[PDB]
C-alpha cells in the first residue's frame with residue numbers, strides 16, 4: 001500500500017499546540033519547520049512528480065487577542081491556486097522512497113512577485129497538501145495527502161512570543 005508519513009511530527013506538534021505561524025513577505029520566506037515526508041508503496045520503476053499546495057482551513061480569518069487566537073473577521077478572496085513543484089520532479093519511485101522528501105526551498109509570500117513562491121493571505125489558516133503525479137499516464141492519476149499536524153496561520157510578523165522563541169530554540 002502507498003504510505004506517505006510526516007517526518008518530525010513531534011516537532012510539528014510543539015508548534016501546533018501553540019498554534020503555528022509562518023512569516024509571509026514581499027520576496028518570500030522559507031518555512032520552519034520544513035515539511036518532510038517518508039514514502040513507501042510507490043512503483044520503484046515508475047516516474048512521479050511531487051507537488052505541494054496550501055489549502056484554506058476555514059471560512060473566516062484569525063486574530064491574536066489577549067494571548068489567544070480567535071475568529072477575526074470574514075475571509076479575503078481565496079489566494080490564487082499556487083502549486084510548488086518539488087525540484088527532484090520528475091523522478092523514479094526508487095528516488096522518492098530511498099530518503100525523506102524535503103520541501104526546504106518553498107517560499108511563502110503575500111505579494112504576486114513570481115519566483116515559484118506560494119501566495120498566502122495574512123491571518124488565514126492553511127494546511128499543507130502533497131500530490132504525487134505519475135508521469136506518462138493517459139489517466140493522469142494523482143494521489144493527494146493532507147498533513148493536519150502542519151497547519152499554520154500566515155503572518156507578516158509573529159503574534160505569539162512563544163512561537164517567536166520556539167522558532168529560535170529549534171532553528
Ligand SMILES: COc1ccc(NC(=O)Nc2ccncc2)cc1
Nearest residue numbers: 008009010011012013014169170171
Ligand atoms: C518535543 O520535543 C522535541 C524536540 C525536538 C524534536 N525534533 C527536532 O528538534 N528536530 C530538528 C531537526 C533538525 N534541526 C532542528 C530540529 C522533536 C521533539
